[PDB]
């Protein structure tokens, strides 16, 4: 079906379902569905690229090695991941997924798994 990019917000910690549900509640409170940006995520072990639906304009690109955490929200449509934007600086990227966030969350976990193996292969 369809993914919507909800945007991103700073967060205080690199990990935690509490942190991502906090971020999702803030963003959900301050936007209406009409404002949500239709999009899709190009997932690779190196990077995730968030692309606008028709135009394919780049809305973000995130390196998988600095993704610290990801989760599905308490509402099953929600997906979020936390990026270590810097050593002590964390940014949460959030999505609404129809029919639910399962396939996208699992793709992004899979990128992290393959990227991690690369890190081990690099130093074997």
């Amino acid at each position: 079906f369809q993914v919507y990019y909800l945007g991103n917000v700073p967060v205080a910690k690199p990990v935690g379902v509490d942190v991502i549900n906090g971020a999702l509640e803030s963003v959900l409170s301050s936007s209406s569905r009409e404002q949500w940006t239709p999009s899709h995520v190009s997932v690779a072990p190196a990077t995730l690229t968030i692309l606008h639906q028709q135009t394919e304009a780049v809305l973000g690109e995130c390196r998988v090695r600095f993704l610290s955490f990801l989760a599905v929200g308490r509402d099953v449509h929600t997906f979020a991941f936390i990026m270590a934007a810097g050593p002590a600086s964390f940014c949460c990227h959030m999505f609404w997924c129809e029919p639910n966030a399962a396939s996208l969350s699992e793709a992004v976990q899979a990128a992290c798994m393959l990227r991690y193996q690369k890190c081990l292969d690099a130093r074997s």
């Binding site: 690199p14 990990v15 935690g16 379902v17 991502i20 998988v64 090695r65 600095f66 993704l67 610290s68 955490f69 990801l70 989760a71 599905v72 929200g73 308490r74 099953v76 270590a84 639910n100 966030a101 399962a102 969350s105 699992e106 976990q109 992290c112 798994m113 990227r115 991690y116 890190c119 081990l120």
Partner: peptide
């Protein structure tokens, strides 16, 4: 418990810590 719902509940309850970041962090 469908195959979806098991992985799905874990994704909600626990999420997932990227071992790449945890690896590259220790060093």
């Amino acid at each position: 418990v469908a195959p979806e719902e098991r992985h799905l509940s874990k994704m909600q309850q626990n999420g997932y810590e990227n071992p790449t970041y945890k690896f590259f962090e220790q060093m």
